[PDB]
Amino acid sequence: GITAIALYDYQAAGDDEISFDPDDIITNIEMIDDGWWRGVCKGRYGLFPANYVELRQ
Amino acid sequence: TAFQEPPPKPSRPKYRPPP
Numbered sequence: 489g490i491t492a493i494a495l496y497d498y499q500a501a502g503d504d505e506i507s508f509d510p511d512d513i514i515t516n517i518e519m520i521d522d523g524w525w526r527g528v529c530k531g532r533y534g535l536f537p538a539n540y541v542e543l544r545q
Numbered sequence: 546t547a548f549q550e551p552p553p554k555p556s557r558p559k560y561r562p563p564p
């Protein structure tokens with residue numbers, strides 16, 4: 489499906505947001521908000537600040 | 546070898562109320 493990789497190390501400052509390491513890439517990352525994303529990091533889903541993350545193509 | 550500073554935070558996403 490979809491995928492993404494964190495540009496830097498970020499801390500999800502949200503109730504429905506998860507954190508992940510830069511090199512730590514995740515899968516199943518869809519784009520709901522033009523500024524925010526959502527994907528599965530190590531099994532669990534969450535939200536990603538597009539600012540510290542980038543999908544893959 | 547890449548160097549980049551952290552970007553600003555985006556506005557919280559919109560979410561409708563629960564059913």
